[PDB]
Amino acid sequence: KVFGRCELAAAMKRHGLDNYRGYSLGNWVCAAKFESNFNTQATNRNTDGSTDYGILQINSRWWCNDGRTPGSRNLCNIPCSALLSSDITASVNCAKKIVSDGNGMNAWVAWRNRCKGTDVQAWIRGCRL
Ligand SMILES: [Cl-]
Ligand SMILES: [Mn+2]
Ligand SMILES: [Mn+2]
């Protein structure tokens, strides 16, 4: 599914991401834009042989099992294919475990390089929420 900006913001707020671990909703919308361009089906293969999956580009080395990443830890206890669904529940639930891991949203390199320190409330401007 390719979400619209406000449609994704509403879905994220429904699933309890607004101010989750102190990160306002615009942070999450910004991270999704630059990681997947709001496309639940996005996949990208990394140099280490792992793959990133879905709207928040969750990694197969640590977080989900794709059956081709040796030594995967599968800390979210899910097949990575679950993260490509039009229903964002599985991605949100796994993202909450990632942001809680000690480094906050710095776990998403696009967030650190493109959203951190910017006016992230712009990402939710104009939306009915
Ligand atoms: Cl933090
Ligand atoms: Mn990425
Ligand atoms: Mn990557």
Curated annotation (Swiss-Prot):
Recorded hits in CDD domains, A to Z, give: LYZ_C (cd16897)
Which domain of life, per UniProt?
Eukaryota
Biological process (GO) annotations?
cell wall macromolecule catabolic process; defense response to bacterium; defense response to Gram-negative bacterium; defense response to Gram-positive bacterium; killing of cells of another organism
Q: What is its EC number?
A: 3.2.1.17
Pfam families linked to this entry: Lys
- Give the catalysed reaction(s), semicolon-separated: Hydrolysis of (1->4)-beta-linkages between N-acetylmuramic acid and N-acetyl-D-glucosamine residues in a peptidoglycan and between N-acetyl-D-glucosamine residues in chitodextrins
Disulfide bonds listed in the record: 6-127, 30-115, 64-80, 76-94
Write down the PROSITE patterns for this protein, in alphabetical order. GLYCOSYL_HYDROL_F22_1 (PS00128), GLYCOSYL_HYDROL_F22_2 (PS51348)
Q: Which residues form a coiled coil?
A: none
Q: Report the active site residues.
A: 35, 52
Provide the alphabetized UniProt keywords: Allergen, Antimicrobial, Bacteriolytic enzyme, Disulfide bond, Glycosidase, Hydrolase, Secreted, Signal
Domain C-type lysozyme as annotated: residue spans? 1-129
Q: Does the keyword Hydrolase apply?
A: yes
Q: Where does substrate bind?
A: 101
Q: What are this entry's molecular-function GO terms?
A: beta-N-acetylglucosaminidase activity; identical protein binding; lysozyme activity
Subcellular locations according to the entry? Secreted
Query: Which GO cellular component terms are attached?
Result: cytoplasm; endoplasmic reticulum; extracellular space
The protein's predominant localisation is: secreted
Tissue expression summary: In the egg white and polymorphonuclear leukocytes.
* Annotated function: Lysozymes have primarily a bacteriolytic function; those in tissues and body fluids are associated with the monocyte-macrophage system and enhance the activity of immunoagents. Has bacteriolytic activity against M.luteus.
What more the UniProt record tells us is:
Lysozyme C is capable of both hydrolysis and transglycosylation; it also shows a slight esterase activity. It acts rapidly on both peptide-substituted and unsubstituted peptidoglycan, and slowly on chitin oligosaccharides.
Report quaternary structure and partners. Answer: Monomer.
**Family according to the record:** Belongs to the glycosyl hydrolase 22 family.
- Protein name listed in UniProt: Lysozyme C
Organism equals Gallus gallus (Chicken)
